[PDB]
Design a protein around this ligand. Structure first.
Ligand SMILES: O=P(O)(O)OC[C@H]1O[C@H](O)[C@@H](O)[C@@H](O)[C@@H]1O
Ligand SMILES: O=P(O)(O)OC[C@H]1O[C@H](O)[C@@H](O)[C@@H](O)[C@@H]1O
Ligand SMILES: CC(=O)N[C@@H]1[C@@H](O)[C@H](O)[C@@H](CO)O[C@@H]1O
Ligand SMILES: CC(=O)N[C@@H]1[C@@H](O)[C@H](O)[C@@H](CO)O[C@@H]1O
Ligand SMILES: *[C@@H]1O[C@H](CO)[C@@H](O)[C@H](O)[C@H]1NC(C)=O
Ligand SMILES: *[C@@H]1O[C@H](CO)[C@@H](O)[C@H](O)[C@H]1NC(C)=O
Ligand SMILES: *[C@@H]1O[C@H](CO)[C@@H](O)[C@H](O)[C@H]1NC(C)=O
Ligand SMILES: *[C@@H]1O[C@H](CO)[C@@H](O)[C@H](O)[C@H]1NC(C)=O
Ligand SMILES: [Cl-]
Ligand SMILES: [Cl-]
Ligand SMILES: [Cl-]
Lengths: 301, 298
């Protein structure tokens, strides 16, 4: 449908290919790090609603709406959850964000990584509360992870990077497109890194350029984790990734990656749906949240 | 600001004026009644999201979004709540829907009646869980109430109507504008009944904004309506609301408070996009409002 890939999810080329093709400005490191903030005497998070006027290239103005969530102690409060609960990805299980969220008393929960809509298979790298759920085998998509010592990681990782046991990843999830790198829009570089020069680069561009519902995760200079969500509907309402990156750039976000969007985009506040999903409740025309894969959860305990 | 009245809330004329000026087709009765459904073997409610394309008279298209909530046993599950809890109106108290809702474990809660934004005074008639909270003194605004035997009441009521003790109101709340009467748009009649002959009321009707409404369908189920918006920028005007509910087979409905007051709270969590700002920031914030319309367990 609105997926970035037509055959298999992710590029076929290696991490060294990604490294050699990135701009000299970033040296030879294909990721960014930031020590997580440690505000253990603060509330867990801040949930912010925005309704903003967006201008597209044609000059027409549109209203968009969504949430920005700030997490003050990411190491202790952020979890990557399998659909429905532990073991969900092994069963190709799909489940609403709310249902999965209620397994951990999540204060805020958003849909997470990409999945195969036909088979329900989880995609990308997945580490959930210290447990390796899925090793993609070094597939080069944008990554977000939290290491055991509190380091936030954004960008492109090798299979060796994610399997390290010195300072192991305790949370890891994959998206598609690295939106911001070091406070700069990184979409053009992401297209080079995350699409196959061979198999249908056009469909990947349409995924970037079309407006839709979108979600993203990033961080600011203070080490706070930033969750982004904008409601929309592919080719009808919402934002394209250029607009998402600019919006986050103006929110002082340093690094951010794009997570699953379209009808998957869901914002759940303390177990209740608090967004407007795009899918229909067939055969009726009411709107319904989608059964999705992994979930990004922010919990109190 | 976007209030329907510039001086005092409500028209200056009596219920006798409303009766004398209403259309001949409706006789001398200025309200509608409907036995509430009592589906005790159904879920308490069904809350559905809509995102729809609306066209106005000028032909321009806009997207609107909100919720429709159906209540299967209104008598046992619907409550009109005072801001913050019992006694809130006596103190001119204003409070978030979310805060007021947690005093009754509301599954769904929306902002309720109109209030004075400067003093915080509650407006209209208010009966909360069998308790008479406010007697407006016969002010002729659109009313919604539930009587003890399960009768749903919509429309214009006299002071004698609300003080009756034979089959007394257990819930009662006032809005502004009777949107639908007997399945027909009733906005022109509402302007006649609820405004003084002495433009500002018309603008309140015609401008687009966030809106909320309560009504019922042929089955006696109660319908809660909410559409997000911002006065003169996004949302719907009352003509569009009446048509939207009319196409959902709503028989009678009244317009409740809108604008920045419009709030939809799902299981204690804010689940809409309010228009007010979190001053001095540009984020959006729910407003501290007055009475709340609450849907709770039986
Ligand atoms: O998440 P999206 O972009 O809305 O795509 C989801 C869509 O995929 C295809 O186009 C169809 O199967 C649609 O029925 C479905 O709604
Ligand atoms: O609920 P509304 O329609 O957005 O109006 C609220 C606003 O009305 C006017 O613009 C002003 O008087 C504001 O002080 C007020 O906050
Ligand atoms: C615009 C957008 O992000 N659409 C996504 C699609 O790309 C993805 O493949 C699918 C399943 O993960 O969910 C959504 O439809
Ligand atoms: C468009 C609309 O419903 N605006 C209302 C206004 O009429 C009302 O007076 C005020 C307080 O009750 O709340 C909102 O601003
Ligand atoms: C990305 O490349 C496009 C070419 O499609 C160009 O027009 C645009 O200016 C570039 N944007 C950035 C942020 O480099
Ligand atoms: C979350 O919701 C549950 C019931 O839905 C409630 O008991 C709990 O207090 C809520 N938590 C917060 C932080 O509001
Ligand atoms: C409202 O009233 C005016 C004049 O009385 C009339 O022209 C208009 O068509 C009416 N509209 C509706 C919907 O009744
Ligand atoms: C409200 O939450 C409780 C469980 O926490 C339950 O009654 C129901 O699932 C929820 N109701 C709605 C309408 O979401
Ligand atoms: Cl090499
Ligand atoms: Cl008179
Ligand atoms: Cl107007």
């Amino acid at each position: 449908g609105s997926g970035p890939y037509t055959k298999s999810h992710g590029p076929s080329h290696s991490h060294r290919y990604v490294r050699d093709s990135q701009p000299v400005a970033h040296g030879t490191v294909t990721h960014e790090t930031q020590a997580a903030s440690k505000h253990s005497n603060s509330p867990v998070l801040e949930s912010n609603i925005f309704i903003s006027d967006i201008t597209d290239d044609s000059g027409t103005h549109r209203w968009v709406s969504g949430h920005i969530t700030e997490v003050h102690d990411p190491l202790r409060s952020v979890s990557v959850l399998e659909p429905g609960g532990p073991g969900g990805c092994a069963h190709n299980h799909r489940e609403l964000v709310e249902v999965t969220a209620k397994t951990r008393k999540c204060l805020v929960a958003q849909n997470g990584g990409y999945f195969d809509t036909h088979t329900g298979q989880c995609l990308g790298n997945i580490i959930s509360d210290g447990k390796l759920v899925r090793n993609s085998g070094g597939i080069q998509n944008a990554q977000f992870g939290i290491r055991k010592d509190g380091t936030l990681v954004f960008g492109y990782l090798s299979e060796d990077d994610i399997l390290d046991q010195e300072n192991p990843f305790v949370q890891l999830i994959s998206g598609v497109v690295w939106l911001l790198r070091k406070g700069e829009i990184y979409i053009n570089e992401s297209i080079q890194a995350e699409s196959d020069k061979t198999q249908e680069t056009g469909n990947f561009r349409h995924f970037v350029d079309v407006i839709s519902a979108r979600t993203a995760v990033g961080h600011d200079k203070e080490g706070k984790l930033i969750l982004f969500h904008v409601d929309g509907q592919t080719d009808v309402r919402g934002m394209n990734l250029w607009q998402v990156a600019k919006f986050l750039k103006d929110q002082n976000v340093m690094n951010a990656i794009n997570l699953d969007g379209g009808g998957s985009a869901t914002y759940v506040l303390n177990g209740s749906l608090a967004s407007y999903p795009s899918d229909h409740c067939n055969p009726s025309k009411w709107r319904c949240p989608r059964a999705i894969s992994t979930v990004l959860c922010i919990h109190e305990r």
